[PDB]
Structures are given as structure tokens and as C-alpha cells.
Amino acid sequence: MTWNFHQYYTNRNDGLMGKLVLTDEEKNNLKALRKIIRLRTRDVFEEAKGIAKAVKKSALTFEIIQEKVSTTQIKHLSDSEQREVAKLIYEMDDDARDEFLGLTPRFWTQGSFQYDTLNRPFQPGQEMDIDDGTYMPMPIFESEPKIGHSLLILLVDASLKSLVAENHGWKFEAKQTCGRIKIEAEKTHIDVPMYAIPKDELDSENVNLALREGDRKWINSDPKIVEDWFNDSCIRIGKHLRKVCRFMKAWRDAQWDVGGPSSISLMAATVNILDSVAHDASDLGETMKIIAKHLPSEFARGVESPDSTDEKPLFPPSYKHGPREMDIMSKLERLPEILSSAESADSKSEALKKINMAFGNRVTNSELIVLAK
């Protein structure tokens, strides 16, 4: 009794991959959602820039500026927020207004869904986490850019909130790093962080994330850093990297209804292990056992972000562990034992049941599990 699980994992119909990967349709529906947001955000900025251009032509009273604001999509903000938008437009200097009039919101063409490892949600209440940033090409700024933090966030909020008003089942929720649209019926939420970038390329640093609460209004955070890291890793290691990342993310979804380690911490740890430990990429069952064996050590040490400019660990080191991190360490230690137990189970039926204690009950096809060669 030594069971092989390579097809349990990799089978694109009945295997774990077949249960995790979104259909071409479901993917296109997320793309459609994403497109609706981007269009509305662009539309809102035009409406606002429309008012700004009228002010450049003639400096209107605040009352007239406010009336114009009130009949834009910005009408979906509160009264005080509309006043604030109208006041910011009223207060613009010539230099600032010309900047604003040249600003159109930008979106990332290279962005995939979770580095192309977005899994179908497993447990009831679990939702797909989709991020689509809005990039604001502006002059490089020291503290604050000509176009203010406040105005930009208000306009993005107006965009998201105006969509929420026109679409039943949608809700808005403001977060630290982003505005969020939650669509519970579609088990989906999409986060719209807002970044400031240089007008002329020059993209290394000076990607600035807008923070909604607190003293710092902007922080340096370039999502391209982690994206490049991971894409390069997949090239260096092989096509199985994304698969094993999907599997660990699925394991996480199965072990915790809410909570568990971040997907990125699992990706960083998995990459570290596959770079440093011999494995056979032709057997994902053997490969997963190798990953399972080494994860506890990766997490115990704390998981460093692949972005060297991020001082905060993706997962805390052992000495900073509370009940939640202790819980996570505990399940990580169980994982390699679960995989070995499945491997030596009495039957196909039992082997499936045991491995499904790691990844949840999804795969129903025991025939994917085969007697070892």
C-alpha cells in the first residue's frame, strides 16, 4: 500500500486543479466586473475635470461649483463629501488645476487574478479576493502631489459608490488601503487601491499607495515588485510552482473558514523550499510532501517578503506568535503527516478521504489515486 496522488492533484477535470481553476466563463465575468469599475472611474474623473475646466475658463462661485458637482456621479457621496469636493475644486490654483485637467486614471494591463492562482471559493461565506488598482500619473511629489490625496480618494469613492447604487446586491466598504465593492451573490469582492505614479514612466520607486486612514497619506508600495518576483520564480522553477501554490491556498481555505496564513506568505515559503530542495516536478504528490515537510521551518522563522523594502514579515516569527499563529503552526505540522497517512491508507477510498482532510472534500474521484510504481 503506497498510493500515488500525482493525478489526484493535476487532473484538470476531476483532480484538484479541475476543482480550483475557474471556468473560462467565470473568469470572463470577473473581467467584465473589473471593466465596469474602470469605466466608471474614468467617467467620474471626466465629470470632475469637466467642472474644473469651466472654472479655468471663469472662476465660478462655490455655489455654482457645488450645483455642478451635485448632478455628477459625485451625488452618491454624502452632503459633506460633496461640499468637500466642490471646495477642493474651488480652492485649486492655476498650477494645480492644469495638472488635474491632464490627469486620466490608468489601469494595469499585466494584472492577472492573484498571479494566475485564483481558486474557486470553498467554504460558505468565502469570497474571491480581486484587486484592481487605479494608477494616477502625476508629477513626482515629495510629500503631497498637486492633485490632493483627498480629492482623488473622494472621486474613487464616488465611482465605487455610484456603481453600488445602480447594482442590486452590491455593497461598498472603505478599508485602510482601498475602497471595496462586495458582491455576496457572486462570492466576489474587488478592492480598488489608488496609486500615484510618475507622469513619464520612471517606474522603480515613486509608486505611491494612497492610505485612507492615519498620518501617512502616501506610502511607497509597488505591486510590480511581488508580481515580477513571482513571475520570475515560475520561470526559474517550472510550471508546477503555480499548481503547488494553488494547492497550499486550497489547503488554507479548507483548514480555516476565516483566517489562516496569507496566500503570499504561502507563495514566498513555497518558492524558498523549491529553490533550495531537490524535488521531482513530474510527481506533484512527491513534490507536495517535500513542501509539507519544510513549511513548518519556513513559518517558524517568520516568512520574509520577497520585497526587500518591506520590513514587515508575511508571517510572524515564532517569538511573536499568539493563539492564531500557534494554530497555523499546528496545522502546518499536521500536513506532512496527513500526506503520508493518505499514502499508506488501506484502500483508494480511504486514501482519498485522508488526503481530503488537507484539501477539503472536493475531489470525489478515487481512481485518480493509483498504486505506486
Ligand X SMILES: CN1c2c([nH]c(N)nc2=O)NC[C@@H]1CNc1ccc(C(=O)N[C@@H](CCC(=O)N[C@@H](CCC(=O)O)C(=O)O)C(=O)O)cc1
Q: Which does 131 bind (CB under 5 to 8 A by kind): ligand X, Mg ion, none?
A: Mg ion
191-210 residues near Mg ion, rule: CB under 5 A: 191
Minimum Å gap between C-beta 350 and Mg ion is 38
Number of residues that bind Mg ion (CB under 5 A): 3
Torsion of CA 230, 232, 235, 241, to 10 degrees: -20
Q: Which of residues 131 and 307 has its CB atom nearest to Mg ion in the complex?
A: 131
The three cell numbers of residue 207 are 509608486
Contact 187, 126 (CB under 8 A): yes
Residue 222 binds ligand X (CB under 6 A)? yes
Pattern of binders to ligand X over 86-115, x per CB under 6 A? ------------------x-xxxx------
Q: Which of residues 16 and 136 has its CB atom nearest to ligand X in the complex?
A: 136
Give burial (CB, 10 Å; 0-12/13-18/19+) of 146: middle
Minimum Å gap between C-beta 178 and Mg ion is 7
Contact 303, 268 (CB under 8 A): yes
Binding residue for ligand X, selected from 2, 29, 39, 171, defined by CB under 6 A = 39
Residue 135 binds ligand X (CB under 6 A)? yes
Residue 35 binds ligand X (CB under 6 A)? yes
Residue 141 binds ligand X (CB under 6 A)? no
The set of residues, in sequence order, having a beta carbon less than 8 Å from that of 142 and lying 6+ positions away, is none
Residue 203 binds ligand X (CB under 6 A)? yes
Pattern of binders to ligand X over 231-250, x per CB under 6 A? --------------------
Distances in Å between the Cα of 209 and the Cα atoms of 41, 180, 194, 200, 229 are 17, 15, 6, 18, 19
Stretch of residues binding Mg ion (CB under 5 A), selected from 109-117, 122-130, 310-318, 330-338: 122-130
The answer on whether 24 is annotated among ligand-binding residues is: no
Contact 136, 105 (CB under 8 A): yes
Q: Is 297 helix (H, G, I), strand (E, B) or coil?
A: helix
d(CA 309, CA 208): 13
d(CA 25, CA 29): 6
Phi, then psi, of 138 in degrees rounded to 5 = -140, 165
Residue 224 binds ligand X (CB under 6 A)? yes
Q: Which does 349 bind (CB under 5 to 8 A by kind): ligand X, Mg ion, none?
A: none
Q: Which does 229 bind (CB under 5 to 8 A by kind): Mg ion, ligand X, none?
A: none
Element (H, E) at 195: strand 194-198
Residue 131 binds Mg ion (CB under 5 A)? yes
Secondary structure in 3-state letters for 93-112: CHHHHHHHHCCCCECCCCCC
The answer on whether 362 is annotated among ligand-binding residues is: no
Residue with cell 476531476: 14
Residue 98 binds Mg ion (CB under 5 A)? no
Q: Is 155 helix (H, G, I), strand (E, B) or coil?
A: helix
Can you give the binding site for Mg ion, defined by CB under 5 A?
Answer: 129, 131, 191
Binding-site positions for GTP read 110-115, 249, 263, 310
Can you give the binding site for ligand X, defined by CB under 6 A?
Answer: 35, 38-39, 42, 104, 106-109, 135, 197, 203-204, 207, 222, 224
Binding-site positions for ATP read 180, 221
